[PDB]
Tab-separated table of C-alpha atoms and ligand atoms in Angstrom:
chain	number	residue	atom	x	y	z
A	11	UNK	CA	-33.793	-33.546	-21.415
A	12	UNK	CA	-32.922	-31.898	-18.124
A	13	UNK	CA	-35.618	-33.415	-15.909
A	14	UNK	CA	-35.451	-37.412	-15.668
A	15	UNK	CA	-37.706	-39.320	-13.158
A	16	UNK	CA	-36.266	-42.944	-11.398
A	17	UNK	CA	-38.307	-45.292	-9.503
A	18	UNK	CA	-37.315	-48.275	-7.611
A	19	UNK	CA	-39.136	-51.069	-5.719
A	20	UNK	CA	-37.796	-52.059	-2.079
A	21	UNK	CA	-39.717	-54.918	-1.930
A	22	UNK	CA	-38.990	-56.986	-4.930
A	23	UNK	CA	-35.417	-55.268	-5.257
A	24	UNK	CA	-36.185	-54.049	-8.798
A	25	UNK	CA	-37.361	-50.943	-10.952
A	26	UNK	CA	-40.601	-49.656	-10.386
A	27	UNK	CA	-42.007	-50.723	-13.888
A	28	UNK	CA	-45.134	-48.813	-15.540
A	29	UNK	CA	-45.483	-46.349	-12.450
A	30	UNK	CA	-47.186	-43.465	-13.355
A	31	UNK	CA	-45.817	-39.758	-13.246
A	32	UNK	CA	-46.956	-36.669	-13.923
A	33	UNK	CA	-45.639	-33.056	-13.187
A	34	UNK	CA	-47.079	-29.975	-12.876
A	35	UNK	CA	-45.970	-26.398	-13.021
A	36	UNK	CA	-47.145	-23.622	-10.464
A	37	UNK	CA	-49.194	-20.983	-12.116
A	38	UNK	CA	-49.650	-17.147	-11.698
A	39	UNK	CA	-52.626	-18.426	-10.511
A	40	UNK	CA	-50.925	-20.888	-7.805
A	41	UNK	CA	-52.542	-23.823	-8.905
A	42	UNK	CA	-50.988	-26.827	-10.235
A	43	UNK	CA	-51.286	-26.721	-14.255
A	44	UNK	CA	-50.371	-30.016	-15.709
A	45	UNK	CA	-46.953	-29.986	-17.932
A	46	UNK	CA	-45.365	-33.765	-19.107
A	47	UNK	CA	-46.406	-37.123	-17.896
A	48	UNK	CA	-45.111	-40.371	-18.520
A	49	UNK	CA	-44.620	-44.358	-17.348
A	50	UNK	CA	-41.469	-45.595	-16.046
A	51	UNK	CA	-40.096	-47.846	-18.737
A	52	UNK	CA	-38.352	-51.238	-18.022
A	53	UNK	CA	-35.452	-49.802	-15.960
A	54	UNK	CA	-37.595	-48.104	-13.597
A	55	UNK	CA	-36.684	-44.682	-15.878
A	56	UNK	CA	-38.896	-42.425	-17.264
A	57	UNK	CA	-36.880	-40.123	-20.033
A	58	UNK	CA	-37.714	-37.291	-22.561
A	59	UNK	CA	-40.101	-35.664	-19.973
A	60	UNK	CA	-39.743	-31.966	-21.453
A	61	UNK	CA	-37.241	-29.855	-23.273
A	62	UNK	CA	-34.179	-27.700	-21.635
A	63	UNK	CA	-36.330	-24.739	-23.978
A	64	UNK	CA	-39.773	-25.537	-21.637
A	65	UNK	CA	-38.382	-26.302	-18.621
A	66	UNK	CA	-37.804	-22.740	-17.097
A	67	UNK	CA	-37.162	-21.528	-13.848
A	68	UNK	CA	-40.273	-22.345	-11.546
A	69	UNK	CA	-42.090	-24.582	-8.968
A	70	UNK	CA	-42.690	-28.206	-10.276
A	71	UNK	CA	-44.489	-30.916	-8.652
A	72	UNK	CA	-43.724	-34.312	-9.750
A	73	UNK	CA	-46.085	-36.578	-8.352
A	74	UNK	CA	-45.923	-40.788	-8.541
A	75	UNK	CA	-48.900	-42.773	-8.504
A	76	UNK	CA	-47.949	-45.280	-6.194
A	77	UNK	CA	-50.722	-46.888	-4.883
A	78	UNK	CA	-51.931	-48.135	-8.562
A	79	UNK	CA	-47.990	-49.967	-8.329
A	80	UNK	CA	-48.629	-51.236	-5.484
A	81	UNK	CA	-52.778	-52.493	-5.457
A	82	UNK	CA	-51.279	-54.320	-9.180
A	83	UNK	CA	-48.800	-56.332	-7.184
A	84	UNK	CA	-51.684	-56.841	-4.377
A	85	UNK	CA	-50.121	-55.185	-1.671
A	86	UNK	CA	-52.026	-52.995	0.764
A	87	UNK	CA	-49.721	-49.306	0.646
A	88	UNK	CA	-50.476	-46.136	3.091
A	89	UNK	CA	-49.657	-43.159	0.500
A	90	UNK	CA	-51.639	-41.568	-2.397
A	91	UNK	CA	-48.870	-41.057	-4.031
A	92	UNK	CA	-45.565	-39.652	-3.614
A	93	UNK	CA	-44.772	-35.983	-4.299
A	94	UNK	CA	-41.788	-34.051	-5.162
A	95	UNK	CA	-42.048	-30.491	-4.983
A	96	UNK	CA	-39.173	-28.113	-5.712
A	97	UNK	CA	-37.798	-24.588	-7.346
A	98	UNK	CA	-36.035	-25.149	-10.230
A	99	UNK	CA	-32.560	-23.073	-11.203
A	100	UNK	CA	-30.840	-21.903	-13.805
A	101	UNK	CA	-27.013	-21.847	-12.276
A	102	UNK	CA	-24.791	-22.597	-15.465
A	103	UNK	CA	-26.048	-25.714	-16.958
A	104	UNK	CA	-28.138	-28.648	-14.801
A	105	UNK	CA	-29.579	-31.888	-15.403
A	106	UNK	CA	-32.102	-33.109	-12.486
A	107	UNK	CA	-32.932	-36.883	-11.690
A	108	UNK	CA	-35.948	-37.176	-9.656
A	109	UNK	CA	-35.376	-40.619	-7.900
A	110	UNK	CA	-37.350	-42.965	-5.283
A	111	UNK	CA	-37.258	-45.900	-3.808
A	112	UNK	CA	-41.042	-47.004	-2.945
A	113	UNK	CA	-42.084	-49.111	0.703
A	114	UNK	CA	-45.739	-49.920	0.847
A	115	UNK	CA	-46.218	-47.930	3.962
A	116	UNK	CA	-42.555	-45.779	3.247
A	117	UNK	CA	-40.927	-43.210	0.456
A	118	UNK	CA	-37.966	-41.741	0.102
A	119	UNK	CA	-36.766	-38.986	-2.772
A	120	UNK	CA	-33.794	-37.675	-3.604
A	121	UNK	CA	-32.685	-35.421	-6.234
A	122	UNK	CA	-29.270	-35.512	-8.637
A	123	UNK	CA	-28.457	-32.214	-9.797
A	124	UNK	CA	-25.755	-32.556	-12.423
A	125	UNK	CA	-24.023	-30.549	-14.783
B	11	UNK	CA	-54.620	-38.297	19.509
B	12	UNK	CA	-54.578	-40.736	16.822
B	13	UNK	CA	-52.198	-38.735	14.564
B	14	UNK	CA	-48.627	-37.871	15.340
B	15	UNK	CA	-45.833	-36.376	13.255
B	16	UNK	CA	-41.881	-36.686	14.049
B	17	UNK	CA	-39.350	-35.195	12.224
B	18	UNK	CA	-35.672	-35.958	12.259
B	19	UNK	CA	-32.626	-33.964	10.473
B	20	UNK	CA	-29.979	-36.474	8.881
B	21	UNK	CA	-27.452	-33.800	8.578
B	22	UNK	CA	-27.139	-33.114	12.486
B	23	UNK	CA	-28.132	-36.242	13.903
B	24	UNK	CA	-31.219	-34.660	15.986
B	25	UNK	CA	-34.879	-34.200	15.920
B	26	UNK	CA	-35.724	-31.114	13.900
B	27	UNK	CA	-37.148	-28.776	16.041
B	28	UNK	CA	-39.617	-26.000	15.421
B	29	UNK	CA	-40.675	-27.741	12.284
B	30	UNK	CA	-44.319	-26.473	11.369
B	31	UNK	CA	-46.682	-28.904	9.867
B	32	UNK	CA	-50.172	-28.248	8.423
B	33	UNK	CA	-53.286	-30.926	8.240
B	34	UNK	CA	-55.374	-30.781	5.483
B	35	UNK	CA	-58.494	-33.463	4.782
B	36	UNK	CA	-59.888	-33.221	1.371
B	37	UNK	CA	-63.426	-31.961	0.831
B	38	UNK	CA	-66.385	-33.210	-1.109
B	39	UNK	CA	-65.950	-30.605	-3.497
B	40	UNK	CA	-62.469	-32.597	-3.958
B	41	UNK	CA	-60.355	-29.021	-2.477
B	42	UNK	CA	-58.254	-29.640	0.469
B	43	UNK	CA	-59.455	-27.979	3.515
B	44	UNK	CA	-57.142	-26.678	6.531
B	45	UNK	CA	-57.725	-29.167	9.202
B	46	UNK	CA	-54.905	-28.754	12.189
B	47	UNK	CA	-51.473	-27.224	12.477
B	48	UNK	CA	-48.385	-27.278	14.765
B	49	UNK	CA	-44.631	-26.679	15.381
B	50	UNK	CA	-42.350	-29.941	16.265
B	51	UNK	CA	-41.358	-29.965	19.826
B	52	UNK	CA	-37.639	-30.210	21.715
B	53	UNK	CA	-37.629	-34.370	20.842
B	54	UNK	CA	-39.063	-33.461	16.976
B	55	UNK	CA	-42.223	-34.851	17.889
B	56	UNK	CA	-45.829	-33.067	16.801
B	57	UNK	CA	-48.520	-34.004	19.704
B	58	UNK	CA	-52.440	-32.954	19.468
B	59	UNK	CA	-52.825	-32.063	16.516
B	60	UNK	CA	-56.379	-33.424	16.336
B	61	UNK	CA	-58.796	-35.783	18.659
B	62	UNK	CA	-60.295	-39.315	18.089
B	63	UNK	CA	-64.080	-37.468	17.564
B	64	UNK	CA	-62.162	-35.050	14.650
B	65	UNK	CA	-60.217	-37.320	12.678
B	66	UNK	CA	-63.464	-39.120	10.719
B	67	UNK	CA	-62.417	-41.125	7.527
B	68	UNK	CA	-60.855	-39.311	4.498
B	69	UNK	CA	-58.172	-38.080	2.322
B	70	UNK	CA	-55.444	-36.320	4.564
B	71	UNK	CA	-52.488	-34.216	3.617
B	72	UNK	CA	-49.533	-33.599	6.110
B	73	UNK	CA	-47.380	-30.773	4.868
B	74	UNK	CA	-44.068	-30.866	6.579
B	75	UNK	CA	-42.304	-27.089	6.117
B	76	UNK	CA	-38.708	-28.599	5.468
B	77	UNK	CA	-37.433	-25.627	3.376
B	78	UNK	CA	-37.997	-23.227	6.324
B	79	UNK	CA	-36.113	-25.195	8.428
B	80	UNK	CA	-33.094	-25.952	6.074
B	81	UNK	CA	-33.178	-22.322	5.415
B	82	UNK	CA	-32.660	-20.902	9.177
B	83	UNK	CA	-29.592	-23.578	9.236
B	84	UNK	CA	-27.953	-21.512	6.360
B	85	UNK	CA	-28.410	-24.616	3.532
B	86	UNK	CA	-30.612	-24.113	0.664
B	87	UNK	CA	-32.682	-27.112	0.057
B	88	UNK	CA	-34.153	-29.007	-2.933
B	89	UNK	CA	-37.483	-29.415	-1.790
B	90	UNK	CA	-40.339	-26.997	-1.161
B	91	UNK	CA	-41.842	-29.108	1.907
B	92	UNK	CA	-42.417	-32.775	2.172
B	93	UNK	CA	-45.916	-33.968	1.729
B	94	UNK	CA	-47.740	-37.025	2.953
B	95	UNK	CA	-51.229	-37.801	1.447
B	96	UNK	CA	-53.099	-40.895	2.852
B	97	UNK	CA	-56.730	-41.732	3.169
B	98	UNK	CA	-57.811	-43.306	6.456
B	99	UNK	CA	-60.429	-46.293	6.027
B	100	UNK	CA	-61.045	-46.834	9.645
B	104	UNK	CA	-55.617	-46.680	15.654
B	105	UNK	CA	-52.522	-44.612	16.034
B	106	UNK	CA	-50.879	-43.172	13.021
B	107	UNK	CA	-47.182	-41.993	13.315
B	108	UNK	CA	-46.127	-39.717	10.371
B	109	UNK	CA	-42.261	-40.059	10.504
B	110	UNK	CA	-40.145	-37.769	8.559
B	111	UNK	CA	-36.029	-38.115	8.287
B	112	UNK	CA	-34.778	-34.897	6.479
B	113	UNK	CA	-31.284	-34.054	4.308
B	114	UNK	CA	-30.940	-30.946	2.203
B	115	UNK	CA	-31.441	-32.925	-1.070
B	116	UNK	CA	-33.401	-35.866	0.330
B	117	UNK	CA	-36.519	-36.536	2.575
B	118	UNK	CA	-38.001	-40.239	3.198
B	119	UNK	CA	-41.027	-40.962	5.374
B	120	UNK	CA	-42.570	-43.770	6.809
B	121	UNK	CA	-45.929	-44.388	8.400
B	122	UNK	CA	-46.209	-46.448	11.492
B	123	UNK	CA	-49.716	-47.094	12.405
B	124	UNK	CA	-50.511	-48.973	15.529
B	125	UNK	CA	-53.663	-49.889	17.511
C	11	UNK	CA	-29.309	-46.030	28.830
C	12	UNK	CA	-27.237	-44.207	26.737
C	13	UNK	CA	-28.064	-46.616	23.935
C	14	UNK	CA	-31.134	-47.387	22.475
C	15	UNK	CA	-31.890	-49.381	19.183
C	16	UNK	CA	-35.166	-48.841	17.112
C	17	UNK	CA	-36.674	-51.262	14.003
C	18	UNK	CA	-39.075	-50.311	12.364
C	19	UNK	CA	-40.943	-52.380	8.935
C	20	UNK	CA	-41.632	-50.323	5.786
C	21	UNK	CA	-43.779	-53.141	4.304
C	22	UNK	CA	-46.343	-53.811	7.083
C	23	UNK	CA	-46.129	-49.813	8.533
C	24	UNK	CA	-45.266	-51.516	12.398
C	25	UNK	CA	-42.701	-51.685	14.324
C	26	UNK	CA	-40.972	-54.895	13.599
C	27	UNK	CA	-41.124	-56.754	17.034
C	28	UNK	CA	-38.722	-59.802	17.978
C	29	UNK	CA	-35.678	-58.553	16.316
C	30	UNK	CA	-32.565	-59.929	17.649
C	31	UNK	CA	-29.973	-57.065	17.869
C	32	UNK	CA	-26.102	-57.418	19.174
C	33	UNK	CA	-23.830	-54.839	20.029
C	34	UNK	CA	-19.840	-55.284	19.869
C	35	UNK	CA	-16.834	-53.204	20.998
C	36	UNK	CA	-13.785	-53.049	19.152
C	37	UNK	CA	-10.774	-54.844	21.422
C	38	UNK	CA	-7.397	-53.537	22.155
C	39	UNK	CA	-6.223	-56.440	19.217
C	40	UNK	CA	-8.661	-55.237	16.831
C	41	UNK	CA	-11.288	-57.768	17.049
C	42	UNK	CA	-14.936	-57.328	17.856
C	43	UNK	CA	-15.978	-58.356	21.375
C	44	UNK	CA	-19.679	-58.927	22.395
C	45	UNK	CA	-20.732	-56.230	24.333
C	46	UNK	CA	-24.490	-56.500	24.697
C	47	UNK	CA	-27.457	-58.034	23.288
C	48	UNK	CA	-31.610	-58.153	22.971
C	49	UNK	CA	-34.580	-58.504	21.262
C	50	UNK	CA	-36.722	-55.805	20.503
C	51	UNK	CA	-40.257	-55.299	22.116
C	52	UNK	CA	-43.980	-55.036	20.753
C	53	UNK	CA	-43.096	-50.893	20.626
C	54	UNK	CA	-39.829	-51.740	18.114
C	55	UNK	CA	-37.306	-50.254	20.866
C	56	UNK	CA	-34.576	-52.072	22.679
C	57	UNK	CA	-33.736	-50.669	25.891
C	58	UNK	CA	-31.080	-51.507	28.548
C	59	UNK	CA	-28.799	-52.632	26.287
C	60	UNK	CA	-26.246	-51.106	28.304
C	61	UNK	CA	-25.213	-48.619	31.306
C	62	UNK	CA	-23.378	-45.023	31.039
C	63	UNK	CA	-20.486	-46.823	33.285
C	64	UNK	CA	-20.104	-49.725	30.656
C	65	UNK	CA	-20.661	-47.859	27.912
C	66	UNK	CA	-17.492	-46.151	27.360
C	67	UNK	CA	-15.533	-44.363	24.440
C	68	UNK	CA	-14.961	-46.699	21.750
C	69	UNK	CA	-15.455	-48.127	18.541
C	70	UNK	CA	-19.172	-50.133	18.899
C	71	UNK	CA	-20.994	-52.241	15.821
C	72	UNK	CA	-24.776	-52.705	16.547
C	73	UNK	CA	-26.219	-55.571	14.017
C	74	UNK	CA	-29.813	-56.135	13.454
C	75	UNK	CA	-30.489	-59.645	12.153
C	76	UNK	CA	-33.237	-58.551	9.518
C	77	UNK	CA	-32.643	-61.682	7.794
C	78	UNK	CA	-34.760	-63.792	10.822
C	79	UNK	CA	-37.337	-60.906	10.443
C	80	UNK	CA	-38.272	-61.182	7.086
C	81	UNK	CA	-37.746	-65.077	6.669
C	82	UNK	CA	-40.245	-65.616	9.967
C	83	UNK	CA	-42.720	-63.223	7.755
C	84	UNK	CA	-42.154	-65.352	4.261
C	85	UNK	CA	-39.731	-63.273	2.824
C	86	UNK	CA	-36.619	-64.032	1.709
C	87	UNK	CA	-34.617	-60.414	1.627
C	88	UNK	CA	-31.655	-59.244	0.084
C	89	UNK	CA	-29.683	-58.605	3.436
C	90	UNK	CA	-28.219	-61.116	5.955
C	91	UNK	CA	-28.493	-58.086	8.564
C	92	UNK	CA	-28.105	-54.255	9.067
C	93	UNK	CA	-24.698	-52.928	10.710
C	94	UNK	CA	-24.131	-49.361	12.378
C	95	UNK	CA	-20.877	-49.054	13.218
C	96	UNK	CA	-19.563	-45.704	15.102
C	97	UNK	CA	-16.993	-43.906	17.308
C	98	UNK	CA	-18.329	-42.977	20.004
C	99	UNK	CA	-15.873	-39.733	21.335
C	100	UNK	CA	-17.457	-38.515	24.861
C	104	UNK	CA	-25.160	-38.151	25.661
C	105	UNK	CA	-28.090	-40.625	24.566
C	106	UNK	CA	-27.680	-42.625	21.009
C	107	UNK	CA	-30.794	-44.149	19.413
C	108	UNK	CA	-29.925	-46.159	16.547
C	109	UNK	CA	-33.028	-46.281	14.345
C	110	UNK	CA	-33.620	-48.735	11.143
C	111	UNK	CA	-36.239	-48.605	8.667
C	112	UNK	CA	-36.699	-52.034	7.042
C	113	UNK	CA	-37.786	-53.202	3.849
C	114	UNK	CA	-36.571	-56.734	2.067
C	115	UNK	CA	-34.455	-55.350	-0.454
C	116	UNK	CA	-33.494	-52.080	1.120
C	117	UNK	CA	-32.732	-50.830	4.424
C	118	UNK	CA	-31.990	-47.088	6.158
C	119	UNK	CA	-30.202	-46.318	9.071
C	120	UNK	CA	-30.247	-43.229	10.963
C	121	UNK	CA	-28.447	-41.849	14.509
C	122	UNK	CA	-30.414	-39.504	16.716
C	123	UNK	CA	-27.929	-38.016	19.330
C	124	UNK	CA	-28.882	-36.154	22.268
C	125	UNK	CA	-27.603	-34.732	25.302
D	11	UNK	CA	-20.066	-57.237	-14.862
D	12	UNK	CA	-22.371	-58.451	-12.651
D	13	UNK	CA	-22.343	-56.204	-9.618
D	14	UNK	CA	-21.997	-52.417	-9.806
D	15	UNK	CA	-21.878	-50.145	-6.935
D	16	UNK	CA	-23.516	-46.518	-6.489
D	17	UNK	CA	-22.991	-44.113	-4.362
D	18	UNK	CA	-25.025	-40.726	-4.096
D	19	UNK	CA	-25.143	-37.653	-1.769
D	20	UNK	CA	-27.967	-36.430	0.270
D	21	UNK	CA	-26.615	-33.055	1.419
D	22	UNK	CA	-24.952	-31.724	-2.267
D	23	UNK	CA	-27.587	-33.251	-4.237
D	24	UNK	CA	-24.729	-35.305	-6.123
D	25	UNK	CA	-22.770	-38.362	-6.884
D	26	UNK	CA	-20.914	-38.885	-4.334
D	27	UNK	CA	-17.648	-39.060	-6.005
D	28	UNK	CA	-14.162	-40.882	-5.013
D	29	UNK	CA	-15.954	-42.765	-2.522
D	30	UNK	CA	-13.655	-45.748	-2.026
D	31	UNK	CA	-15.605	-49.543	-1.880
D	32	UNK	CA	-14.241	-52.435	-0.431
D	33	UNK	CA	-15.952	-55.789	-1.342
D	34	UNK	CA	-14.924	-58.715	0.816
D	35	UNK	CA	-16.178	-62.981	0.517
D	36	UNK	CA	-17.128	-64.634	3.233
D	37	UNK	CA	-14.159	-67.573	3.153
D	38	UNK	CA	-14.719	-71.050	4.410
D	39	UNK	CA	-12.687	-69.865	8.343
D	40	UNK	CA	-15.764	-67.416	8.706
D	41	UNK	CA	-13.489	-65.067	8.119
D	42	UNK	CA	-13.848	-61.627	5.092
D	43	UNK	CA	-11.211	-61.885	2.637
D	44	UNK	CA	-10.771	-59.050	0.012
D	45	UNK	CA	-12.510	-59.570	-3.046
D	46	UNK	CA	-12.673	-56.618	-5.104
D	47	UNK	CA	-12.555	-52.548	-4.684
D	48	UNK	CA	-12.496	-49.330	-6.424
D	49	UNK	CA	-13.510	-45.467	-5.856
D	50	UNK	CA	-16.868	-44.332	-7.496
D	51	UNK	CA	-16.433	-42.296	-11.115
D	52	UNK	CA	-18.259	-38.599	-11.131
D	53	UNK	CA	-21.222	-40.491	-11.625
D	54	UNK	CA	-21.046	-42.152	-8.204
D	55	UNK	CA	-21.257	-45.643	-9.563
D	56	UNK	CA	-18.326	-48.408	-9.219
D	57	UNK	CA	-18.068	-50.846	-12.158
D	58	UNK	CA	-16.026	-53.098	-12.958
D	59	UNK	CA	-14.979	-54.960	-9.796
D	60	UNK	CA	-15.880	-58.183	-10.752
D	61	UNK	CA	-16.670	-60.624	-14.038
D	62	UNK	CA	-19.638	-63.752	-14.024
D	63	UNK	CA	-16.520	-66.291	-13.682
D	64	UNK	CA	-15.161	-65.215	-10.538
D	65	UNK	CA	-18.236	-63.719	-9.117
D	66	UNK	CA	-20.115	-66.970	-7.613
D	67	UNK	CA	-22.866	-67.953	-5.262
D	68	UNK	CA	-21.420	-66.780	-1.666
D	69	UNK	CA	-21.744	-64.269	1.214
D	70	UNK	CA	-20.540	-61.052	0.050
D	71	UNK	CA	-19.986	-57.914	2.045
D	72	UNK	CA	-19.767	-54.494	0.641
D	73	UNK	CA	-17.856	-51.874	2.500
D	74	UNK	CA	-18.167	-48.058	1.593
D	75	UNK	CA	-15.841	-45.726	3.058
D	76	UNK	CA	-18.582	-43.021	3.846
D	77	UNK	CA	-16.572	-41.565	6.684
D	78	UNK	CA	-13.724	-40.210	4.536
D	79	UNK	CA	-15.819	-38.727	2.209
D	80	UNK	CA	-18.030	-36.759	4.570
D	81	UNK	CA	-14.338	-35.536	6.699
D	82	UNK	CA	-13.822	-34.511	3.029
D	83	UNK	CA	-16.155	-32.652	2.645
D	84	UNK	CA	-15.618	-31.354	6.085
D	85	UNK	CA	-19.138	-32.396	7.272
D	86	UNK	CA	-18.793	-34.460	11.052
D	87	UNK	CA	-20.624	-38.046	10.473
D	88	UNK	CA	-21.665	-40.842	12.142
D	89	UNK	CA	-20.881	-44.218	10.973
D	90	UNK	CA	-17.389	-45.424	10.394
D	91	UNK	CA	-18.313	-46.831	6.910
D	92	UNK	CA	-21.627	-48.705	5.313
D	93	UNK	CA	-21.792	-52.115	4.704
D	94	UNK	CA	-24.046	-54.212	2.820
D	95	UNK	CA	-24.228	-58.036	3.345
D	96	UNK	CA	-25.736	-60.325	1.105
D	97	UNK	CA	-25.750	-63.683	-0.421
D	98	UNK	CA	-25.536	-64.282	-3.869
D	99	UNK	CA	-27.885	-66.411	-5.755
D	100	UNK	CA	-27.947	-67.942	-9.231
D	101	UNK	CA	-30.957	-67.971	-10.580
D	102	UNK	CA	-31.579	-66.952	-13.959
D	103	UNK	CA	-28.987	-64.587	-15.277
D	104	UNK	CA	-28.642	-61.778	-12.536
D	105	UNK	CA	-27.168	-58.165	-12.345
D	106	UNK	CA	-26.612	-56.719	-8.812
D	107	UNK	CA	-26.514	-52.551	-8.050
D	108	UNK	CA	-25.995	-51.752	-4.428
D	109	UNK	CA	-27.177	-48.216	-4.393
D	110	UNK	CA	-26.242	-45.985	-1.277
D	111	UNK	CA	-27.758	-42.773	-0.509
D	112	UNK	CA	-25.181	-40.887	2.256
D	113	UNK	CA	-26.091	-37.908	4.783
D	114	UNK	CA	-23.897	-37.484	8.025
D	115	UNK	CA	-26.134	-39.227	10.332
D	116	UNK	CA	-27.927	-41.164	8.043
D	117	UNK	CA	-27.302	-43.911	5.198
D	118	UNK	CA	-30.124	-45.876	3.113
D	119	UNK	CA	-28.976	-49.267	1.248
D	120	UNK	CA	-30.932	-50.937	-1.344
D	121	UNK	CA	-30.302	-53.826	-4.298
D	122	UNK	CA	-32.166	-53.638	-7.261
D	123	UNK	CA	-31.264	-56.812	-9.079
D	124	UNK	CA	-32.280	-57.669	-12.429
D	125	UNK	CA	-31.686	-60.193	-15.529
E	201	LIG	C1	-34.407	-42.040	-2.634
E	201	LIG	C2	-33.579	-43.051	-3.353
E	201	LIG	C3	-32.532	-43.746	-2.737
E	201	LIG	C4	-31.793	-44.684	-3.477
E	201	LIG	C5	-32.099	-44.902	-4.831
E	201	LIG	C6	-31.333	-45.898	-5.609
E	201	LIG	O1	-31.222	-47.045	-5.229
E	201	LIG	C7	-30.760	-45.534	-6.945
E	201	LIG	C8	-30.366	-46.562	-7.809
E	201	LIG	C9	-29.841	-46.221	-9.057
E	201	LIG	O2	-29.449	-47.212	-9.909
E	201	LIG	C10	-29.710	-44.879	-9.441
E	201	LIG	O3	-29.195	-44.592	-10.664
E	201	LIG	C11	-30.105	-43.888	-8.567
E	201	LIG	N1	-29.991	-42.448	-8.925
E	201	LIG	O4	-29.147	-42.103	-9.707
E	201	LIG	O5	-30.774	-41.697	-8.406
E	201	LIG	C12	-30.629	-44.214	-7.323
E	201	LIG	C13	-33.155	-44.207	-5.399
E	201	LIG	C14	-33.873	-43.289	-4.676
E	202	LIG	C1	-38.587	-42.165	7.202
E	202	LIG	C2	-37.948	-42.325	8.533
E	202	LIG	C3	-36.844	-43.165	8.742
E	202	LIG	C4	-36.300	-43.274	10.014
E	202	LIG	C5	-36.860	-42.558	11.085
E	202	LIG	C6	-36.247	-42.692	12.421
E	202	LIG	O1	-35.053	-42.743	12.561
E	202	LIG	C7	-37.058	-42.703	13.656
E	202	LIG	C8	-36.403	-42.332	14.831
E	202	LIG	C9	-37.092	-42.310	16.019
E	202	LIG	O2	-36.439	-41.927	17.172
E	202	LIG	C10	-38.425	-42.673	16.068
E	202	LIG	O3	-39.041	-42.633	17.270
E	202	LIG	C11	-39.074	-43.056	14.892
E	202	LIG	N1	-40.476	-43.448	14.902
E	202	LIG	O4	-41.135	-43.209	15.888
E	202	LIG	O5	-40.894	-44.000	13.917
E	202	LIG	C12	-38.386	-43.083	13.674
E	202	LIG	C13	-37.941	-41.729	10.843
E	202	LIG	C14	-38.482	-41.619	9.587
């Protein structure tokens, strides 16, 4: 798989169990068409999102529901969610890991592009 | 104004300047509507971008343009822009953005 | 001041007021000497730490007792504190941290 | 092994690799004695530097050298190094990863501990 989406709790110093995610693909149309979706397992990792044959070159949205994490551990957060929203690449082989570490009222993403 | 942005670049060490940002507040027909825009100052800070009498309760997307701005520094980024989506139930809200070509965070600092 | 220190808390979206911060400089023998020190204020900014006379080239650590922060809210975090430590090799520093119990971010914003 | 160490970078998008880590122990003088260290594999992450036995409730401090990688990489940073400080706690069996996300100006530090 060469999309895999990480999600870690600053609060309780821990994965970000059964979060939410689901990713989109930009259209012709340029609206967001829904593509793969998934929970974070036990690890905080959420694997086997799509196929290196599906996932071609485009704009992808990955968006995290984290307010439904945070309102089950009863904690009052600021965002939505959190979205990532990038341009995919074919430049010899590539392996992304979507990963972010979740404040009530703070995000941060980063991406690992590997080979 | 009760909304301000701030963006910083972790690369330089400096605000990011000339950053533009676009407001949008959700509609009742659930499409996001263009609501306010603006360029980050000389200190990265984004002043006025709305009054106490405009910003009524809703959903509200910030769009930070962070590609633009890694791109007219020569680096090509991973991300498109950095969003913020909140809803506002009611006070000052700070929308605080620290940038790096293959990372973003932001944090909301909201004040009364 | 050519030094200023900002806390801010990722849990509660504030500033985080009260925070005890120290600054040391790096002796001749190699051992940190206590330089300056403060608390910071209902805005999360420390200012005055220090003067452009005193605050010379060197090798500084600012620390940032989180650990008082969190425990005085009910938390018990990971960290016993948050350390910068920098060269400085001439300009205004802000030292910015972004708190949350088990994680924290530091960032330098350096102007002229 | 019950602490690992990971290192990533914010500007390449990357493990940050060869990054060496110094862990130190807070000794009974007050004073940090080396511990343990290591430079990070091409995955960025440090393992190995210490077993259950030796690795016991104390004040630890974890030292990355972040300003030889970014002079490296020929990129001028900010801090001398990262550290992490912590103390250790049995309770339960417990796995440590300090995970460190690196730009010039800029470093992020979190623990995600689990059983
Ligand atoms: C934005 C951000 C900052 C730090 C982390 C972070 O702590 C982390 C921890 C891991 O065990 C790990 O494997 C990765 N990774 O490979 O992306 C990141 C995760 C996200
Ligand atoms: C996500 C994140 C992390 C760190 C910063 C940050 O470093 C920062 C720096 C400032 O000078 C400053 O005035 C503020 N602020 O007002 O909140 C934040 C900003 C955003």
């Amino acid at each position: 798989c060469p999309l895999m989406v990480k999600v870690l709790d600053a609060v309780r110093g821990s994965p970000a169990i059964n979060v939410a995610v689901h990713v989109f693909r930009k259209a012709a149309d340029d609206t967001w068409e829904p593509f793969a979706s998934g929970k974070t397992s036990e690890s905080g990792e959420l694997h086997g999102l799509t196929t290196e044959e599906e996932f071609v070159e485009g704009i992808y949205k990955v968006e995290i529901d984290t307010k439904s994490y945070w309102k089950a551990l009863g904690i009052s957060p600021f965002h939505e969610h959190a979205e990532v929203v990038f341009t995919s690449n074919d430049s010899g082989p590539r392996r992304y890991t979507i990963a972010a570490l979740l404040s009530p009222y703070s995000y941060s993403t980063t991406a690992v592009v590997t080979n």
